[PDB]
DNA sequence: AGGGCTGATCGTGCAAAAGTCGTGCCAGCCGTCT
DNA sequence: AGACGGCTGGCACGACTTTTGCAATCGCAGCCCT
């Protein structure tokens, strides 16, 4: 169950607990949080990107 | 079905004025999704399906 | 010019025609940015 | 030495049929074995973005579909429009009949007669194509769409009127006479024929994304490697250490019991998998004693392969070689064949050889290529040509190993000069 | 005080009926030549 | 213009494959029934 609730934080927010990495990378995953914040989020090029 | 009214009732949008935001529950949660998921498969390379 | 999939054909069928008519719709994007937000426990929908 | 029925020893060996030992043999189901074990791994306890364009046609039917909307068509004349270009196949043709459509239509003021027109301002669509019929209409509408200075125009459009059987059954005597053909004027209409873009819609599919999954590889650099049958892709989990230390120093005599018998699964699921890789390399190692020998030879040079021969090279269980020859693939530098083609049929040889039935299929097809285009050579020849290469093979093999190699009739296959 | 008896742990096969292939062979038919 | 021929394909019979459907009895001994 500890597993479970840590993979869920991570499927929410990775950069905030833990650190998920790809197959033979280091860079972290793009939660259903990051595709929302950053210079990379919807939010932005939503205003006319 | 009339096959003329069908095509039409497809393009149609509402006043969709006042957006509103709030938090969610399970069975509304159940309300909005159709299927329960339970594999983790995602696709079959053997028919493609 | 957007992600509005049924305002392209129409345009362009006004243009041809010489209609020179739009009507807005809504860009798919903003269903895009509503599904993604109803992907976390968040709910929000549109009033009349 | 020889006394019969003598003193019986006593047996120091069992069978010991599990059916635990069946699935570690899993038929080697790879790919599903693979999501066996993973399946079971899960029930084990203590056990173990992109560019995305996103942008294509969609096979020309959006584009059909544009076309039509972009056409000034009424509302009404819209949806049935939208109706028959959904009763479009890959290839061009109507799935549904005319019937059909009126009956999906589902309104009695919507007549024949109408849906024809509708069909017909359809049949003019945008590409080519768009006939929804037999490509004869197909061709009726691109040697519309072609000039008519093209020679024999007027008579390749009689045959395909009402002579079209005629032409399906290569009867060139009954077709030139009914149709006063002259000599030579029916190769120019089947060379204006060869260029009617058949299956039009087929090329407007031009994507297709290839399919290949590695399995077992044959490189064999240098004679004999050890190729790896997907070694990468093979498994080879193993438990939670980890956790079976923590198992180890359960306090509960009950809890370390519980974790003795994961640890006995444990243990049974690395046998399993020892089992599997050294069966796929003594299946390897048997196929390098004669697999260079085929490939050098070729594909009509194949002999012929025994299961049970195999497996008592191998020196394993009959049964267990068949169970592995299943759902088994092996990539060669040749290409990628099953495990069964891989394995070869038998059939009689001349001269105290056995040849296999790809062998004999693969030299009537290469006997094939070597004939006259008018007239193809007949089962008789092929049977004659087979005499010639004394493979023994009758006029019957060499109609299976024709089936096989899907050789078109005789009269079907034979064309003017 | 004496009998019943209960579950731990007990590891690469095979065969037998079924199926399926190799091979041959006959029956008709159409293209044909007489 | 009816028969020659070759094809094709169904029909049959041996010869090779092959798949699934198959596991007790312990030797401990304490507990329960008699």
């Not at chain 4, 995305?52 to 949806?79: C, I």
């Not at chain 4, 050098?296 to 025994?306: D, H, R, T």
């Not at chain 4, 693969?362 to 008789?380: F, G, H, Q, T, W």
């Amino acid at each position: 169950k500890r597993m479970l609730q840590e993979a869920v934080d991570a499927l929410l927010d990775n950069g905030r607990r833990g650190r998920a990495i790809t197959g033979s990378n280091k860079r972290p995953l793009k939660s259903l949080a990051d595709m929302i914040k950053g210079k990379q989020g919807r939010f932005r090029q939503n205003l006319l990107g | 079905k009339d096959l003329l009214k069908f095509l039409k009732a497809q393009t149609k949008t509402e006043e969709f004025d006042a957006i509103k935001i709030a938090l969610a529950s399970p069975d509304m949660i159940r309300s909005w999704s159709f299927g329960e998921v339970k594999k983790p498969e995602t696709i079959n390379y053997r028919t493609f399906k | 010019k957007s992600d509005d999939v049924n305002g392209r054909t129409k345009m362009y069928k006004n243009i041809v025609d010489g209609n020179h008519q739009m009507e807005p719709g809504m860009p798919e994007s903003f269903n895009v940015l509503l599904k993604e937000i109803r992907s976390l426990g968040i709910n929000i929908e549109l009033e009349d | 030495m020889k006394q019969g029925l003598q003193l019986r020893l006593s047996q120091q060996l069992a069978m010991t049929p599990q059916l635990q030992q069946a699935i570690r043999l899993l038929q080697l189901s790879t790919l599903e074995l693979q999501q066996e074990l993973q399946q079971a791994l899960e029930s084990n306890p203590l056990l173990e973005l992109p560019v995305y364009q996103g942008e294509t046609t969609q096979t020309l039917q959006d584009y059909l579909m544009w076309q039509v909307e972009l056409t000034p068509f009424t509302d009404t004349d819209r949806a049935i429009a939208t109706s028959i270009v959904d009763a479009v196949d890959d290839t061009g043709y109507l799935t549904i009949q005319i019937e059909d459509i009126v009956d999906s239509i589902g309104d009695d003021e919507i007549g024949l007669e109408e849906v024809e027109a509708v069909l017909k301002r359809i049949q003019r669509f945008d590409p080519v194509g768009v006939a929804a019929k037999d490509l004869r209409d197909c061709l009726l509408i691109q040697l519309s769409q072609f000039a008519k200075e093209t020679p024999w125009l007027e008579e390749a459009r009689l045959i395909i009127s009402d002579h079209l059987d005629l032409l399906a059954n290569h009867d060139f005597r009954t077709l030139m006479r009914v149709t006063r053909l002259k000599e030579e004027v029916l190769k120019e209409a089947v060379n204006l024929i060869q260029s009617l873009d058949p299956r039009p819609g087929q090329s407007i599919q031009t994507s297709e994304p290839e399919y290949v999954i590695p399995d077992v590889l044959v490189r064999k650099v240098s004679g004999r490697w050890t190729v790896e049958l997907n070694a990468d892709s093979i498994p080879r989990l193993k438990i939670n250490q980890q956790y079976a230390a923590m198992g180890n120093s359960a306090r509960n005599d009950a809890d370390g019991q519980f974790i003795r018998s994961n640890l006995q699964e444990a243990r049974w699921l690395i046998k399993s998998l020892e089992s599997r890789n050294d069966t796929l390399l003594r299946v390897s190692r048997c196929i390098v004693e004669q697999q260079q020998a085929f490939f050098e030879q070729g594909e009509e040079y194949m002999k012929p392969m025994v299961l049970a021969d195999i497996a008592q090279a191998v020196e394993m269980h009959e049964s267990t070689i068949s169970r592995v020859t299943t759902q088994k693939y092996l990539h060669s530098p040749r290409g990628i064949f099953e495990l069964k083609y891989f394995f070869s049929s038998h059939v009689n040889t001349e001269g105290g050889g056995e040849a296999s039935s790809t062998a004999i299929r693969a030299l009537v097809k290469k006997l094939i290529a070597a004939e006259n285009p008018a007239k193809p050579l007949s089962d008789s020849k092929l049977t004659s040509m087979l005499s010639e290469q004394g493979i023994m093979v009758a006029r019957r093999t060499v109609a299976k190993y024709r089936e096989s190699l899907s050789i078109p009739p005789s009269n079907q296959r034979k064309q003017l000069v």
